[PDB]
């Protein structure tokens, strides 16, 4: 049929082979004559999947042995409250670096539970950049320092991560996890809803330093303790088995293309196609982010006025582009170009953008 | 290549629902994307989301003053979310204990407030549902919590108590939409989908709206999800899609009364086999409390138990081992387990008895 270009921001494009693989074995997985969705999570066929998803992640990001990988339900949003529930103890402070709307949502949940602080913020200038690490206001009684690696709605991204030694560094990496190599030991915990760059909705990957959080926290509901899930290897209650399976399949694909290092090269190339288009447009398109902070995962821009914005987005949708409307809170446009978005989609978008401009 | 899926959770699903999923896995609704690749704020997803709710409303005849929520975290998260929202100071979370799942729910409430046991058949190892006239209720109960089907013990409420002093709340994980329900008896009903309704990953919560909050985390307030139609954060979109598909299958076969007929025949096959076995197979539940969803039983000794389950596995039966906490055998016969599987089980039970 006609072309479809999938720039959805979350859930988002999956790599075709992961979907083709799932489709082919949907009714009979691993010769059991059952769908993976119909298996016990205590079955050896399921446990193989669960363990393989962990081992692929471990290998791909080179996660150290003193870290454990959790597969949790509830989305990143549930992590916004689970994190302060476990680590934000009395007399301590949940310190946040604000670099977008998702950082504010994280902060708000800690505020419900303890003392919070704002280490640095670019909110005044509408989150066009990542603040300088030298501006970080740190406290001796900080329970952690929390950052948002990729600011999905604003199109900005950490180029690198601060060295923090007084508290654990925590990061919401929902929209750029495993888009590039990572030095995992810079962090006490990393979390990501899978649906942006790792596969389906319904599971949240939580990489945690075991000794920071393998201990019972008095007064915390069993399901909301990290310890629960660490001890039970994310099998305390019934896991999202199909989501974890699809995550496995996506991880296999990342490994098959050369891992984090190769996918970064691909992601830089796709991003470049779009940013060069913006940058050669003589102001017809204006990127929200400052150049040093441009995200490789979510490209945010506006045309010169809202009428042109709307005509551009209507034309895109007529031409088969999906998901380009900016987040409802900020308007404009947003090209999400996560790992699995193909480069010819990016070329197509550039073509769209150039003819729209020339014809305007 | 014969396989009979008696898994207790996650579990068998309807072949037509899985075949339909397979067929359109790469191209949902002519969008040329998987349902898994759609934005949850897309109309495409939003229609599926709503269709899943609509089918439950139709099939259970859920009144307008109830809302239907799709949450993550399993029935287990509901164990704490419920008291978190309703167990206010000076009130009591009152529990009816009819098995281990009851116990797990009560435990979470004890973290958050005053609790109470209205009744319990624990002393007798949960062989039955207590008589409602036995319940000990309190003026200040925040709710009365029950477990409609005691998955590990094989017992099930035949009917529900008429409770007017406080909302009746039910963990229906292992029997929701296996028979018609009078939803007006309850203030809230909850169930992980992964037994009767869909794959794991989504929890269905049916809640009396006006029934349900300072200082509770946003994600743990029912009001958050009611207000946002379970679209506050990203829902488990594929699981809700599969839930829709399963609900379409239940509607297509004739709805809650029709599936009850199938379920009662399935259970009749196994219980008759047990009852006719002259004590070779012994059911755990008192007759009057026998579950239609999980049939629990043992052979005369542990070694026969083990010989049977080994023979079962060799013959393609999956999931019949009893819960580790109780041992024995458990045949889970949720909605999508076909009558032919139960017939096969019977024939195996009879042959095994003959050959012992
Ligand atoms: C998508 C997103 C979230 C929300 O994740 P849910 O799974 O919907 O809770 C949180 N943080 C970031 C940075 C995101 O991009
Ligand atoms: C399966 C079951 C549960 C556990 O559900 P999860 O989704 O694993 O939390 C809780 N209660 C009952 C009655 C169940 O049968
Ligand atoms: Cl953001
Ligand atoms: Cl977003
Ligand atoms: Cl039970
Ligand atoms: Cl169980
Ligand atoms: Mg490979
Ligand atoms: Mg192509
Ligand atoms: Mg139909
Ligand atoms: Mg008879």
XYZ file of C-alpha atoms and ligand atoms in Angstrom:
754
model
C 0.000 0.000 0.000
C 0.926 3.676 0.437
C 3.853 4.763 2.576
C 3.671 4.926 6.369
C 6.411 6.644 8.362
C 6.255 5.967 12.046
C 7.537 8.823 14.147
C 5.412 7.970 17.169
C 6.807 9.174 20.465
C 5.856 6.308 22.817
C 4.879 3.446 22.133
C 6.884 3.627 18.980
C 8.240 1.797 15.952
C 9.606 -1.662 16.605
C 12.262 -3.350 14.515
C 10.376 -5.490 11.955
C 12.341 -8.692 12.642
C 11.267 -8.619 16.301
C 7.649 -8.392 15.163
C 8.024 -10.978 12.398
C 9.639 -13.358 14.874
C 6.806 -12.817 17.355
C 4.176 -13.323 14.658
C 5.640 -16.547 13.359
C 5.691 -18.220 16.783
C 2.622 -16.531 18.316
C 0.630 -19.729 18.539
C 3.478 -22.194 19.167
C 6.462 -20.941 21.082
C 9.540 -23.088 21.534
C 7.632 -26.135 20.288
C 5.344 -26.103 23.324
C 2.248 -25.680 21.134
C 1.325 -22.711 23.367
C 1.775 -19.000 22.887
C 4.392 -17.420 25.137
C 1.328 -15.539 26.437
C -0.214 -18.865 27.569
C 2.775 -20.152 29.536
C 3.409 -20.208 33.265
C 6.108 -17.716 34.210
C 7.550 -20.649 36.180
C 7.838 -22.708 33.002
C 11.328 -23.298 31.685
C 10.350 -21.838 28.337
C 9.344 -18.563 30.012
C 12.290 -18.487 32.408
C 14.682 -18.835 29.471
C 13.155 -15.752 27.902
C 13.231 -13.792 31.161
C 16.871 -14.691 31.789
C 17.899 -14.060 28.175
C 16.353 -10.576 28.242
C 18.461 -9.841 31.330
C 21.646 -11.274 29.792
C 21.249 -9.390 26.528
C 20.811 -6.143 28.470
C 23.829 -6.964 30.629
C 25.996 -7.686 27.627
C 24.727 -4.758 25.551
C 25.180 -2.040 28.150
C 28.008 -3.938 29.894
C 26.202 -3.879 33.219
C 28.459 -4.798 36.179
C 27.770 -7.963 38.215
C 26.861 -5.954 41.296
C 23.883 -4.545 39.466
C 20.604 -6.375 38.976
C 18.115 -5.911 36.144
C 14.464 -5.632 37.169
C 11.427 -5.957 34.933
C 8.577 -4.124 36.666
C 5.028 -3.060 35.774
C 3.675 0.459 36.203
C 5.671 2.477 33.720
C 8.319 5.071 34.412
C 5.600 6.992 36.138
C 5.378 4.409 38.893
C 9.160 4.731 39.331
C 8.676 8.421 40.063
C 7.075 7.426 43.379
C 8.779 4.075 43.997
C 12.214 5.734 44.019
C 11.556 8.247 46.793
C 9.496 5.605 48.613
C 12.578 3.445 48.900
C 15.430 5.911 49.215
C 13.992 9.212 50.391
C 14.245 8.646 54.093
C 13.670 11.082 56.924
C 16.237 13.827 57.149
C 17.296 13.239 53.538
C 16.618 15.159 50.355
C 15.446 14.134 46.896
C 17.600 16.343 44.702
C 16.450 16.861 41.107
C 17.931 18.371 37.977
C 15.060 19.804 35.961
C 15.545 19.630 32.190
C 11.951 19.119 31.077
C 8.359 18.153 31.916
C 9.273 14.587 32.773
C 11.812 15.890 35.295
C 9.071 17.979 36.893
C 6.731 14.995 37.118
C 9.424 12.978 38.915
C 10.045 15.828 41.350
C 6.379 16.276 42.132
C 6.100 12.672 43.349
C 9.098 12.984 45.658
C 7.532 16.155 47.083
C 4.674 13.978 48.266
C 7.076 11.871 50.265
C 9.948 13.918 51.605
C 12.283 16.886 51.351
C 13.210 17.758 47.800
C 15.712 20.167 46.264
C 16.379 21.524 42.741
C 20.072 21.100 41.950
C 19.866 23.023 38.653
C 17.087 23.879 36.198
C 16.729 25.283 32.712
C 13.012 25.841 33.240
C 13.332 29.629 33.049
C 14.509 29.463 29.450
C 11.919 26.804 28.542
C 14.252 23.851 28.772
C 16.323 24.492 25.645
C 19.498 23.117 27.198
C 21.083 20.845 29.753
C 22.535 22.946 32.597
C 26.294 22.954 33.219
C 27.299 20.377 35.845
C 29.212 23.120 37.645
C 25.883 24.750 38.388
C 24.635 21.765 40.362
C 23.683 22.699 43.918
C 24.413 19.517 45.937
C 23.459 18.798 49.596
C 25.268 16.555 52.094
C 21.938 14.946 53.092
C 20.798 14.256 49.499
C 19.269 10.750 49.227
C 20.134 10.767 45.526
C 20.541 13.136 42.620
C 17.865 12.524 39.927
C 18.218 13.428 36.264
C 16.298 12.905 33.019
C 18.850 11.784 30.391
C 16.605 12.561 27.410
C 13.876 15.175 27.740
C 11.310 13.591 25.500
C 8.987 16.539 25.164
C 11.581 19.271 24.758
C 14.111 17.482 22.521
C 17.199 17.905 24.693
C 19.688 15.333 25.902
C 22.642 14.895 28.205
C 25.822 14.483 26.172
C 27.539 12.943 29.159
C 26.804 12.308 32.844
C 28.052 13.975 36.029
C 30.437 12.341 38.422
C 28.593 12.277 41.747
C 30.086 10.765 44.890
C 28.029 12.086 47.818
C 24.770 10.394 46.742
C 23.620 7.928 44.115
C 22.952 9.311 40.675
C 19.499 8.223 39.445
C 18.317 8.585 35.870
C 15.024 8.451 33.994
C 16.366 7.108 30.703
C 12.981 6.160 29.200
C 13.566 7.788 25.821
C 17.275 7.120 25.205
C 18.243 3.933 27.033
C 20.427 1.684 24.893
C 20.601 4.248 22.092
C 24.348 4.502 22.801
C 27.042 3.101 25.105
C 26.602 3.843 28.793
C 28.916 3.697 31.785
C 26.445 2.049 34.108
C 28.648 2.344 37.162
C 28.152 6.112 37.131
C 24.690 5.336 38.471
C 22.943 3.839 41.500
C 19.811 3.242 39.416
C 18.569 3.649 35.851
C 14.930 3.232 34.802
C 13.061 3.274 31.513
C 9.552 2.416 30.360
C 10.355 0.015 27.505
C 7.892 1.508 25.025
C 10.116 4.262 23.791
C 13.317 2.559 22.706
C 13.195 -1.072 23.872
C 9.916 -2.519 22.671
C 6.427 -2.735 24.022
C 4.517 -0.921 26.719
C 3.774 -2.773 29.921
C 7.241 -3.366 31.253
C 9.701 -0.964 32.851
C 13.430 -1.792 32.928
C 15.090 -0.890 36.208
C 18.858 -1.388 36.490
C 19.811 -1.145 40.111
C 22.930 -1.242 42.227
C 21.987 -4.228 44.396
C 23.382 -3.010 47.673
C 21.743 0.400 47.416
C 18.346 -1.216 47.456
C 18.231 -4.938 48.293
C 17.108 -4.074 51.824
C 13.653 -4.002 53.333
C 12.233 -0.572 53.890
C 9.949 -0.549 56.877
C 6.422 0.648 56.120
C 6.624 0.188 52.369
C 4.042 -1.993 50.675
C 5.540 -5.261 49.499
C 4.971 -4.590 45.792
C 6.528 -1.119 46.132
C 9.812 -2.289 47.677
C 12.749 -2.784 45.299
C 13.933 -5.477 47.676
C 10.875 -7.556 46.892
C 11.652 -7.647 43.205
C 15.373 -8.022 43.628
C 14.928 -11.032 45.887
C 12.379 -12.695 43.607
C 14.167 -11.808 40.348
C 11.100 -9.844 39.158
C 8.917 -12.908 39.623
C 7.286 -11.891 42.903
C 3.914 -11.750 41.258
C 2.994 -12.465 37.669
C 5.251 -10.543 35.229
C 4.214 -9.018 31.940
C 5.418 -12.076 30.037
C 4.593 -11.026 26.487
C 6.140 -7.610 27.069
C 9.320 -9.154 28.417
C 9.408 -11.576 25.488
C 9.070 -8.741 22.991
C 11.793 -6.850 24.890
C 13.989 -9.895 24.463
C 13.331 -9.965 20.743
C 14.165 -6.276 20.414
C 17.371 -6.684 22.415
C 18.368 -9.597 20.095
C 17.930 -7.220 17.164
C 20.120 -4.544 18.788
C 22.766 -7.154 19.383
C 22.440 -8.428 15.823
C 23.158 -4.933 14.379
C 26.359 -4.505 16.409
C 25.131 -3.374 19.791
C 25.081 0.013 21.447
C 28.079 1.311 19.607
C 26.700 0.503 16.192
C 23.234 1.768 17.038
C 24.699 5.081 18.181
C 26.341 5.491 14.774
C 22.979 4.841 13.095
C 21.156 7.208 15.488
C 23.669 10.028 14.937
C 23.283 9.605 11.182
C 19.454 9.678 11.219
C 19.430 12.691 13.563
C 21.897 14.516 11.312
C 19.607 14.176 8.330
C 16.876 15.983 10.191
C 18.941 18.626 11.966
C 20.780 19.555 8.723
C 17.377 20.008 7.122
C 16.372 22.367 9.904
C 19.679 24.145 9.804
C 19.651 24.657 6.077
C 16.049 25.961 6.116
C 17.040 29.600 6.750
C 14.712 29.788 9.763
C 11.684 28.184 8.067
C 12.074 25.462 10.676
C 13.382 26.399 14.147
C 14.618 23.706 16.509
C 13.697 24.163 20.162
C 16.953 22.848 21.578
C 20.229 24.680 21.755
C 22.700 22.959 19.465
C 24.922 21.600 22.226
C 21.915 19.862 23.778
C 20.096 18.505 20.732
C 18.526 15.129 21.389
C 19.333 12.219 19.090
C 15.957 10.632 19.976
C 13.305 13.399 19.762
C 13.745 16.292 17.325
C 11.568 19.233 18.361
C 10.846 22.196 16.068
C 8.376 24.875 15.032
C 7.539 26.618 11.788
C 7.352 30.452 11.888
C 3.737 30.539 13.113
C 0.968 28.246 14.251
C -0.845 28.348 10.945
C 2.221 27.019 9.137
C 2.675 24.457 11.924
C -0.801 23.181 11.321
C -0.544 23.072 7.541
C 2.795 21.280 7.798
C 1.408 18.660 10.194
C -1.741 18.185 8.113
C 0.317 17.672 4.990
C 2.553 15.188 6.772
C -0.365 13.184 7.987
C -1.798 13.132 4.440
C 1.583 11.869 3.163
C 1.711 8.962 5.639
C 3.671 10.447 8.511
C 2.526 9.337 11.958
C 3.164 10.982 15.311
C 4.796 14.303 14.299
C 2.507 16.518 16.358
C 4.433 17.931 19.301
C 3.417 16.929 22.834
C 0.096 18.551 23.721
C 1.714 20.662 26.428
C 4.077 22.464 24.007
C 2.708 22.305 20.488
C 4.970 22.506 17.449
C 6.419 19.345 15.948
C 8.388 16.412 17.287
C 10.110 13.805 15.104
C 10.787 10.807 17.378
C 13.708 8.843 15.872
C 14.341 6.077 18.413
C 16.599 3.098 17.520
C 14.085 1.267 15.335
C 12.962 4.200 13.248
C 14.479 3.494 9.822
C 16.776 5.946 8.137
C 14.652 6.094 4.981
C 11.832 7.437 7.157
C 14.163 10.253 8.091
C 15.062 10.849 4.467
C 11.348 10.897 3.650
C 10.723 13.501 6.354
C 13.545 15.636 5.010
C 11.981 15.438 1.554
C 8.651 16.477 3.025
C 10.230 19.335 4.875
C 12.093 20.655 1.875
C 9.165 20.583 -0.495
C 6.841 22.122 2.080
C 9.341 24.933 2.595
C 9.951 25.462 -1.100
C 6.247 25.475 -1.838
C 5.368 27.806 1.014
C 1.754 -33.202 19.197
C -1.095 -33.030 21.725
C -0.986 -30.429 24.470
C -3.636 -29.672 27.084
C -3.168 -26.344 28.789
C -4.240 -26.450 32.425
C -1.892 -23.587 33.433
C -3.175 -21.686 36.504
C -1.962 -18.193 35.593
C -0.977 -17.061 32.959
C -3.248 -19.460 31.110
C -4.839 -20.768 27.941
C -6.438 -18.178 25.678
C -9.055 -18.579 22.939
C -7.507 -19.790 19.681
C -9.585 -17.285 17.625
C -8.268 -14.425 19.730
C -4.638 -15.510 19.249
C -5.123 -16.231 15.540
C -6.678 -12.796 15.072
C -3.727 -11.249 16.897
C -1.274 -13.187 14.753
C -2.929 -12.215 11.501
C -2.774 -8.494 12.125
C 0.357 -8.383 14.267
C 2.253 -6.374 11.646
C -0.622 -4.348 10.239
C -3.329 -3.357 12.690
C -6.506 -1.849 11.242
C -4.804 -1.019 7.934
C -2.447 1.372 9.709
C 0.567 -0.649 8.515
C 1.812 -0.656 12.110
C 1.463 -3.239 14.874
C -1.012 -2.362 17.595
C 2.233 -2.362 19.636
C 3.637 0.475 17.546
C 0.785 2.894 18.102
C 0.780 5.929 20.369
C -1.617 5.446 23.295
C -2.963 8.891 22.493
C -3.769 7.854 18.915
C -7.368 7.438 17.898
C -6.357 4.023 16.665
C -5.326 2.904 20.115
C -8.095 4.884 21.811
C -10.773 2.922 19.969
C -9.334 -0.418 21.146
C -8.996 0.851 24.698
C -12.657 1.908 24.735
C -13.846 -1.209 22.931
C -12.273 -3.362 25.679
C -14.140 -1.335 28.264
C -17.393 -1.470 26.292
C -17.278 -5.234 25.950
C -16.739 -5.764 29.653
C -19.609 -3.352 30.364
C -21.907 -5.263 28.032
C -20.816 -8.727 29.074
C -20.990 -8.117 32.801
C -23.847 -5.600 32.490
C -21.891 -3.024 34.473
C -24.117 -0.085 35.519
C -23.292 3.466 34.440
C -22.261 4.497 37.942
C -19.310 2.074 37.754
C -16.024 2.879 35.992
C -13.769 0.281 34.362
C -10.040 0.753 34.844
C -7.065 -0.888 33.177
C -4.068 -0.737 35.501
C -0.644 -2.331 35.684
C 0.871 -4.183 38.654
C -1.364 -7.236 38.874
C -3.947 -8.105 41.458
C -1.031 -7.949 43.891
C -0.689 -4.179 43.548
C -4.428 -3.893 44.217
C -3.862 -5.560 47.588
C -2.098 -2.347 48.671
C -3.798 0.200 46.394
C -7.203 -0.582 47.869
C -6.399 0.160 51.559
C -4.153 3.018 50.392
C -7.225 4.707 48.987
C -10.021 3.523 51.327
C -8.530 2.511 54.674
C -8.751 5.941 56.277
C -7.888 6.578 59.936
C -10.509 5.280 62.375
C -11.762 2.782 59.820
C -11.117 -0.951 59.463
C -10.144 -3.102 56.456
C -12.371 -6.144 57.099
C -11.382 -9.427 55.391
C -13.074 -12.755 54.796
C -10.319 -15.394 54.667
C -11.069 -18.255 52.275
C -7.549 -19.121 51.187
C -3.951 -17.940 50.845
C -4.760 -15.152 48.352
C -7.142 -13.773 50.966
C -4.230 -13.847 53.402
C -1.975 -11.942 51.039
C -4.516 -9.195 50.597
C -5.098 -8.872 54.341
C -1.350 -8.631 54.917
C -0.997 -5.521 52.754
C -3.865 -3.822 54.541
C -2.183 -4.420 57.904
C 0.651 -2.199 56.761
C -1.642 0.736 56.275
C -4.298 0.605 58.972
C -6.598 -1.308 61.296
C -7.725 -4.696 59.986
C -10.214 -7.367 61.068
C -11.230 -10.900 60.131
C -14.956 -11.081 59.515
C -14.691 -14.849 59.056
C -12.233 -17.506 58.070
C -12.157 -21.153 57.158
C -8.412 -21.320 57.701
C -8.643 -23.568 60.737
C -10.045 -26.242 58.479
C -7.488 -25.624 55.758
C -9.910 -23.592 53.656
C -12.192 -26.417 52.552
C -15.155 -24.158 52.297
C -16.699 -20.707 52.105
C -17.980 -19.555 55.515
C -21.676 -18.957 56.130
C -22.460 -15.290 55.610
C -24.477 -15.323 58.863
C -21.085 -15.938 60.529
C -19.585 -12.651 59.410
C -18.336 -10.244 62.106
C -18.746 -6.750 60.673
C -17.987 -3.319 62.217
C -19.780 0.013 61.988
C -16.485 1.569 60.987
C -15.519 -0.987 58.373
C -13.917 0.826 55.391
C -14.815 -2.173 53.230
C -15.454 -5.887 53.413
C -12.931 -7.801 51.273
C -13.495 -11.293 49.890
C -11.752 -13.586 47.417
C -14.462 -14.909 45.086
C -12.460 -17.936 43.874
C -9.679 -19.347 46.024
C -7.256 -20.314 43.304
C -4.962 -22.444 45.401
C -7.609 -24.210 47.407
C -10.257 -24.872 44.776
C -13.242 -23.246 46.507
C -15.550 -20.523 45.238
C -18.407 -18.305 46.393
C -21.725 -19.655 45.075
C -23.276 -16.285 45.693
C -22.308 -13.083 47.418
C -23.286 -11.522 50.749
C -25.689 -8.606 50.970
C -23.523 -5.952 52.608
C -24.879 -2.445 53.202
C -22.712 -1.021 56.002
C -19.597 -0.752 53.817
C -18.573 -1.525 50.230
C -18.083 -5.215 49.339
C -14.714 -5.661 47.586
C -13.662 -8.758 45.679
C -10.459 -10.250 44.306
C -12.007 -12.077 41.311
C -8.707 -12.814 39.586
C -9.526 -16.445 38.927
C -13.279 -16.348 38.153
C -14.100 -12.931 36.713
C -16.483 -13.187 33.753
C -16.755 -16.961 34.081
C -20.480 -16.544 34.880
C -23.025 -13.700 35.162
C -22.457 -11.236 38.029
C -24.640 -8.692 39.816
C -22.106 -5.886 39.858
C -24.338 -3.727 42.061
C -23.462 -6.014 45.002
C -19.933 -4.631 45.023
C -18.134 -1.365 45.514
C -15.119 -2.729 43.707
C -14.064 -5.828 41.763
C -10.496 -6.499 40.589
C -8.670 -9.174 38.613
C -5.359 -9.687 36.833
C -6.430 -10.493 33.270
C -4.184 -13.520 32.941
C -6.701 -16.194 33.927
C -10.070 -15.550 32.275
C -9.605 -12.398 30.296
C -6.304 -11.965 28.493
C -2.542 -12.206 28.945
C -0.662 -10.958 31.962
C 0.205 -7.302 32.150
C -3.187 -5.675 32.671
C -5.436 -5.603 35.739
C -9.146 -4.922 35.357
C -10.640 -2.813 38.137
C -14.399 -2.204 38.206
C -15.164 0.497 40.706
C -18.202 2.267 41.999
C -17.280 5.761 40.873
C -18.527 7.869 43.711
C -16.738 5.499 46.159
C -13.230 6.302 45.014
C -7.252 11.561 48.694
C -4.484 13.644 50.198
C -0.935 12.330 50.241
C -1.283 9.230 48.094
C 1.160 9.087 45.154
C -0.494 10.115 41.894
C -0.179 6.681 40.260
C -1.702 4.959 43.301
C -4.865 7.044 43.442
C -7.894 5.478 41.803
C -9.029 9.016 41.070
C -6.048 9.558 38.828
C -7.043 6.697 36.602
C -10.766 7.339 36.791
C -10.218 10.966 35.804
C -7.907 10.035 32.944
C -9.821 6.952 31.715
C -6.763 4.757 32.463
C -4.715 6.910 30.078
C -2.890 8.920 32.724
C 0.396 7.223 31.773
C 1.132 4.716 29.033
C -1.186 1.693 29.465
C -0.180 -1.854 28.551
C -1.534 -1.394 25.047
C -0.940 -4.882 23.634
C -2.424 -6.538 26.721
C -5.554 -4.379 26.448
C -5.771 -5.202 22.744
C -5.586 -8.918 23.604
C -8.194 -8.416 26.350
C -10.510 -6.904 23.706
C -9.926 -9.893 21.471
C -10.746 -12.339 24.292
C -13.849 -10.358 25.184
C -14.987 -10.476 21.498
C -14.684 -14.279 21.680
C -16.748 -14.470 24.852
C -19.415 -12.216 23.283
C -19.411 -14.336 20.114
C -20.084 -17.558 21.999
C -23.124 -16.031 23.702
C -21.830 -14.051 26.669
C -21.575 -14.703 30.376
C -24.459 -17.124 30.566
C -23.107 -19.154 27.683
C -19.590 -19.372 29.009
C -21.010 -20.437 32.395
C -22.709 -23.350 30.673
C -19.401 -24.407 29.161
C -17.582 -23.967 32.427
C -20.093 -25.957 34.388
C -19.759 -28.855 31.930
C -15.943 -28.721 32.214
C -16.047 -28.805 35.991
C -18.742 -31.560 35.916
C -16.443 -33.760 33.867
C -13.668 -33.580 36.436
C -15.705 -33.662 39.643
C -17.783 -36.552 38.372
C -14.538 -38.357 37.614
C -13.328 -37.713 41.096
C -16.636 -38.635 42.737
C -16.947 -41.828 40.694
C -13.392 -42.902 41.479
C -14.297 -44.591 44.783
C -11.755 -42.597 46.771
C -8.899 -43.072 44.300
C -8.995 -39.315 43.601
C -10.061 -37.099 46.544
C -11.155 -33.477 46.058
C -9.952 -30.912 48.611
C -13.087 -28.719 48.619
C -16.342 -29.504 50.393
C -18.904 -30.182 47.656
C -20.996 -27.178 48.401
C -17.982 -24.884 47.894
C -16.413 -26.541 44.833
C -14.811 -24.082 42.420
C -15.766 -24.172 38.718
C -12.359 -22.612 37.890
C -9.675 -24.542 39.794
C -10.283 -28.229 40.633
C -8.030 -29.407 43.457
C -7.464 -33.056 44.347
C -4.962 -35.680 45.405
C -4.375 -39.379 44.988
C -4.249 -41.686 48.026
C -0.592 -41.022 48.739
C 2.239 -38.766 47.646
C 3.931 -41.335 45.431
C 0.725 -42.006 43.443
C 0.279 -38.220 43.258
C 3.703 -38.003 41.733
C 3.181 -40.972 39.408
C -0.035 -39.425 38.089
C 1.454 -35.989 37.479
C 4.461 -37.495 35.716
C 2.162 -39.568 33.520
C 0.077 -36.460 32.843
C 3.088 -34.495 31.710
C 4.246 -37.270 29.469
C 0.799 -37.256 27.904
C 0.948 -33.511 27.066
C -0.940 -32.059 30.015
C 0.554 -28.798 31.306
C 0.156 -27.067 34.700
C -1.556 -29.787 36.738
C 0.873 -29.750 39.652
C -0.839 -28.260 42.712
C 0.448 -25.027 44.227
C 3.738 -25.662 46.057
C 2.139 -24.506 49.295
C -0.414 -27.290 49.155
C 0.872 -29.947 46.715
C -1.578 -32.428 45.209
C -3.010 -31.635 41.800
C -4.816 -28.641 40.370
C -6.724 -28.544 37.130
C -7.276 -24.924 36.176
C -10.210 -24.731 33.781
C -10.585 -20.991 33.119
C -12.790 -19.720 30.289
C -10.569 -20.636 27.341
C -9.658 -24.150 28.517
C -11.735 -26.256 26.082
C -14.133 -29.012 27.059
C -12.012 -31.441 25.003
C -9.076 -30.899 27.316
C -11.172 -31.767 30.347
C -12.450 -34.861 28.542
C -8.867 -35.823 27.848
C -8.009 -35.323 31.513
C -10.895 -37.530 32.572
C -9.822 -40.283 30.218
C -6.308 -40.090 31.587
C -7.549 -40.165 35.179
C -9.657 -43.209 34.440
C -6.868 -45.036 32.627
C -4.415 -44.263 35.398
C -6.742 -45.566 38.022
C -7.282 -48.790 36.032
C -3.533 -49.391 35.589
C -2.399 -48.635 39.157
C 7.385 8.271 28.341
C 8.175 8.922 29.507
C 7.728 8.727 30.787
C 6.357 8.082 31.069
O 6.453 6.668 31.050
P 5.151 5.797 31.401
O 5.563 4.403 31.158
O 4.123 6.312 30.484
O 4.906 6.110 32.830
C 8.530 9.062 31.844
N 9.754 9.630 31.587
C 10.176 9.883 30.320
C 11.486 10.637 30.060
C 9.392 9.524 29.264
O 9.841 9.846 28.017
C -3.450 -14.997 40.406
C -4.105 -14.373 41.660
C -3.514 -13.277 42.250
C -2.125 -12.815 41.789
O -2.202 -11.934 40.692
P -0.919 -11.134 40.128
O -1.406 -10.521 38.882
O 0.098 -12.184 39.963
O -0.637 -10.166 41.214
C -4.164 -12.612 43.253
N -5.365 -13.077 43.742
C -5.925 -14.184 43.184
C -7.278 -14.664 43.720
C -5.300 -14.843 42.153
O -5.834 -16.022 41.675
Cl 10.662 16.429 28.864
Cl 6.718 12.077 25.910
Cl -6.288 -19.327 47.488
Cl -2.500 -19.450 42.364
Mg 21.467 -12.649 17.452
Mg 12.763 1.004 3.676
Mg -18.262 -10.473 17.328
Mg -23.546 -38.275 37.736
